[PDB]
A paper describes a structure:
Here, we identified an RRM-containing protein in Acinetobacter baumannii that we called AB-Elavl, starting from a protein similarity search with the human ELAV-like protein HuR. The single RRM domain is characterized by the presence of two consensus sequences: a highly conserved sequence (RNP1) of eight amino acids and a less conserved sequence of six (RNP2). The typical secondary structure consists of a β1α1β2β3α2β4 topology and the RNP1 and RNP2 are localized in the internal β1β3 strands. All these results suggest that A. baumannii express an RRM-containing RBP that shares RNA-binding properties and characteristics with the human HuR for the ability to bind RNA AU-rich region, although with lower affinity and specificity.
The crystals diffracted up to 1.6 Å resolution: they belong to space group I41 with one molecule in the asymmetric unit, a solvent content of about 50%, and a mosaicity of 0.3°. The X-ray structure showed the domain of an RRM domain: β1-α1-β2-β3-α2-β4 with an additional β5 segment present right before the C-terminus of the protein. The two conserved amino acid sequences, ILVNRL and KGFGFVE, are localized at the level of the two internal strands of the β-sheet: β2-β3. The solved structure shows the absence of the first 18 residues in the electron density with respect to the cloned sequence. It is not trivial to tell whether this is due to their high mobility or rather to their loss due to some protein degradation before/during crystallization. It appears quite clear that the fold of rAB-Elavl is very similar to that of the model used for structure solution and, in turn, similar to the typical RRM. The greatest discrepancy between the two structures is in the region involving residues from 50 to 58, just before RNP-1. In our case electron density is missing for those residues, confirming thus very high mobility. The average B-factor along the sequence is, in fact, about 35 Å2, confirming an overall rigidity of the structure, with the only exception being the above-mentioned region 50–58 where temperature factor values are extremely high. The structure of the bacterial RRM domain appears very similar to the eukaryotic one but for the presence of an additional short β strand and a more flexible central region.
Numbering used by the authors: 19 to 96
Write the structure that this text describes.
Amino acid sequence: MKILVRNLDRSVTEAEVLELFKAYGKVESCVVVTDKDTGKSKGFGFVEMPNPREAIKAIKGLNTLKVKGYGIRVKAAE
Protein backbone atom coordinates (compact mmCIF):
# COMPACT_ATOMS: atom_id res chain seq x y z
CA MET A 1 0.00 0.00 0.00
CA LYS A 2 1.20 3.46 -0.99
CA ILE A 3 0.73 6.07 1.76
CA LEU A 4 0.70 9.85 1.27
CA VAL A 5 2.09 12.05 4.06
CA ARG A 6 1.46 15.80 4.17
CA ASN A 7 2.04 18.86 6.39
CA LEU A 8 5.70 18.07 7.07
CA ASP A 9 7.89 20.71 8.65
CA ARG A 10 11.02 21.61 6.74
CA SER A 11 12.94 20.15 9.72
CA VAL A 12 11.40 16.69 9.24
CA THR A 13 13.82 14.09 7.87
CA GLU A 14 13.27 10.85 5.98
CA ALA A 15 14.60 8.82 8.92
CA GLU A 16 12.18 10.58 11.28
CA VAL A 17 9.22 9.61 9.11
CA LEU A 18 10.58 6.08 8.57
CA GLU A 19 10.85 5.49 12.33
CA LEU A 20 7.21 6.53 12.72
CA PHE A 21 5.81 4.17 10.12
CA LYS A 22 8.05 1.34 11.31
CA ALA A 23 6.11 1.37 14.58
CA TYR A 24 3.25 -0.21 12.60
CA GLY A 25 4.97 -2.79 10.39
CA LYS A 26 7.39 -3.32 7.53
CA VAL A 27 8.30 -0.30 5.39
CA GLU A 28 9.59 -0.96 1.90
CA SER A 29 10.36 2.65 0.97
CA CYS A 30 10.09 6.14 2.42
CA VAL A 31 10.50 9.29 0.29
CA VAL A 32 10.37 12.62 2.16
CA VAL A 33 10.47 16.07 0.54
CA THR A 34 11.30 18.94 2.93
CA ASP A 35 13.10 21.60 0.85
CA LYS A 36 13.17 25.35 0.98
CA ASP A 37 10.81 25.03 -2.02
CA THR A 38 8.43 23.46 0.46
CA GLY A 39 7.50 25.67 3.38
CA LYS A 40 8.10 24.96 7.05
CA SER A 41 4.62 23.36 6.92
CA LYS A 42 4.06 21.95 3.42
CA GLY A 43 6.57 19.18 3.01
CA PHE A 44 5.26 15.80 1.94
CA GLY A 45 6.18 12.14 1.87
CA PHE A 46 5.40 8.89 0.14
CA VAL A 47 5.63 5.62 2.13
CA GLU A 48 5.27 2.03 0.91
CA MET A 49 4.15 -0.62 3.40
CA PRO A 50 3.62 -3.90 1.54
CA ASN A 51 1.24 -5.38 4.16
CA PRO A 52 -2.02 -3.40 3.64
CA ARG A 53 -3.28 -4.25 7.11
CA GLU A 54 -0.14 -2.65 8.58
CA ALA A 55 -0.50 0.35 6.26
CA ILE A 56 -4.10 0.89 7.40
CA LYS A 57 -3.03 0.66 11.05
CA ALA A 58 -0.36 3.28 10.39
CA ILE A 59 -2.78 5.62 8.56
CA LYS A 60 -5.20 5.50 11.48
CA GLY A 61 -2.40 5.76 14.03
CA LEU A 62 -0.36 8.62 12.57
CA ASN A 63 -2.96 10.93 10.99
CA THR A 64 -3.04 14.30 12.85
CA LEU A 65 0.05 13.41 14.94
CA LYS A 66 2.03 16.59 15.59
CA VAL A 67 5.55 16.43 14.20
CA LYS A 68 7.65 19.52 14.78
CA GLY A 69 4.48 21.43 15.65
CA TYR A 70 2.29 20.59 12.64
CA GLY A 71 -0.37 17.94 12.59
CA ILE A 72 0.61 15.63 9.78
CA ARG A 73 -1.96 14.22 7.38
CA VAL A 74 -1.66 10.55 6.45
CA LYS A 75 -3.88 8.69 3.98
CA ALA A 76 -3.68 6.00 1.35
CA ALA A 77 -2.69 7.22 -2.10
CA GLU A 78 -5.64 5.23 -3.54
